[PDB]
């Protein structure tokens, strides 16, 4: 009965390595997550968006090493907003395998604040809420640090911050967290 | 050692349709952002748009909209530009630059082709 | 669109002068996350291309000599050319890449003294 949906920054500040980081930390988490009603859908984000599997291509080859593997960094700037729209109205969509009276569940992992953005947040969050999307959100490195950095990230998970939003140091850091984030999509 | 180049000048007639290449001669456009910008003979620089060649994606200024397009073969190591519907408006020297890629979001254009020459008469 | 306004549009040098150039945007152009200003400076010397001088606002490209320095943070921006050389006199061109549409200033011409 639930439906992960990750949106992943691509940005060009994201190092190769930090990126297949990344990359292997999406994969564990689909792995330990092995429900066979559990369904999973990526796309990237920068300045350009990348759908890289649907919840329905999942559903088709369940393997989610051979899925993630392929996926190679967009580089760029960051657009978070115009992303989170483009999850709700493209992946969160019937035709892409969503299944209705599924929960809906997103997980943004991102290195940085999102700058040049065409749409705002108070443009793609009231949608996100109306539609029932549960969003969770990996604020990776240094960015992160300040007051006004911190209130993107609770802009961007669901209400209570406390429940919803994640921090870690680095991508090497994303390890350390692969169990309290499984203890987060159940339902 | 490392530079853009560009097709030559342009003699073209109203209402028909024209194609300019830039082929870097150093690097890989699957590497970079491949940009075009336009210059009206006393009038600044006017961004037209730009490509990610290794995905074929691209941004324009929407008043290029319709009047430009831009495509990329990664085959040929060449990027280019089509301005379709000639007007006099159309007349200026077309730049194709490059945005690397150096580890931010984002970076400015930091190789510049020779410049196209395009007259639109009748 | 991000607006560059570069002032003056013309301006006269001497050899030896030192001489100021600005550049203000509309919108911000320092991203919080790199604390770095999205802002180019080109120079065009007479029937030749643009080449890029500085980047990062501040950033002087390879080959730039020290002579060229530029300063600012988040909207008004200066370029600075501390004894003019003759090889100088050109067209200057700042530009925001923060955001799309990528915007250009006017540009600012040096031309010699009489």
């Known amino acids: 009965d639930s439906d992960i949906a990750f949106l992943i920054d691509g940005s060009g500040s994201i190092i190769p390595h930090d990126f297949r980081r990344m990359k292997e930390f999406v994969s564990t988490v689909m792995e330990q997550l092995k429900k066979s009603k559990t369904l999973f859908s990526l796309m990237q984000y920068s300045e350009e968006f990348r759908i890289h599997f649907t919840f329905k291509e999942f559903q088709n080859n369940p393997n989610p090493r051979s899925l993630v593997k392929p996926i190679t960094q967009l580089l760029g700037r960051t657009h978070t907003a115009t992303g989170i729209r483009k999850v709700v109205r493209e992946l969160f969509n019937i035709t892409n395998g969503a299944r209705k009276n599924a929960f809906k569940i997103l997980v943004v992992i991102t290195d940085g604040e999102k700058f040049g953005d065409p749409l705002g947040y108070e443009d793609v969050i009231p949608e996100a809420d109306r539609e029932g999307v549960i969003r969770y959100v990996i604020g990776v490195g240094d960015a992160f640090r300040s007051e006004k950095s911190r209130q993107e990230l609770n802009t961007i998970a669901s209400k209570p911050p406390r429940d919803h939003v994640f921090q870690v140091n680095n991508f090497e850091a994303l390890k350390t967290i692969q169990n309290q984030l499984r203890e987060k999509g159940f339902a | 050692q490392v530079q853009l180049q560009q097709s030559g000048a342009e003699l073209v007639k109203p209402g028909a349709s024209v194609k300019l290449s830039c082929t870097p001669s150093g690097f890989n456009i699957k590497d970079i952002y491949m940009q075009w910008v336009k210059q009206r003979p006393e009038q600044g620089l006017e961004w037209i748009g730009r490509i990610d060649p290794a995905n074929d994606k691209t941004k324009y200024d929407p008043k290029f909209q319709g009047k430009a397009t831009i495509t990329a073969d990664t085959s040929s190591n060449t990027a280019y530009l089509q301005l379709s519907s000639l007007t006099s408006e159309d007349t200026a020297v077309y730049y194709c630059?490059?945005?690397?890629?150096?580890?931010?979001?984002?970076?400015?254009?930091?190789?510049w082709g020779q410049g196209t020459t395009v007259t639109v008469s009748s | 669109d991000i607006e560059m306004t570069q002032s003056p549009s013309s301006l006269g040098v001497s050899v030896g002068e030192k001489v100021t150039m600005s550049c203000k945007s509309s919108q911000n152009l320092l991203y919080s996350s790199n604390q770095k200003n999205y802002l180019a400076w080109y120079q065009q010397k007479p029937g030749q291309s643009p080449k890029l001088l500085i980047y990062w606002a501040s950033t002087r490209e390879s080959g730039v000599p020290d002579r060229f320095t530029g300063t600012g943070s988040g909207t008004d921006f200066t370029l600075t050319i501390s004894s003019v050389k003759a090889e100088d006199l050109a067209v200057y061109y700042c530009?925001?890449?923060?955001?799309?549409?990528?915007?250009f200033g006017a540009g600012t011409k040096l031309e010699l003294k009489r």
């Open positions: 630059a490059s945005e690397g890629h150096y580890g931010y979001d984002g970076y400015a254009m930091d190789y």
């Open positions: 530009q925001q890449y923060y955001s799309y549409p990528l915007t």
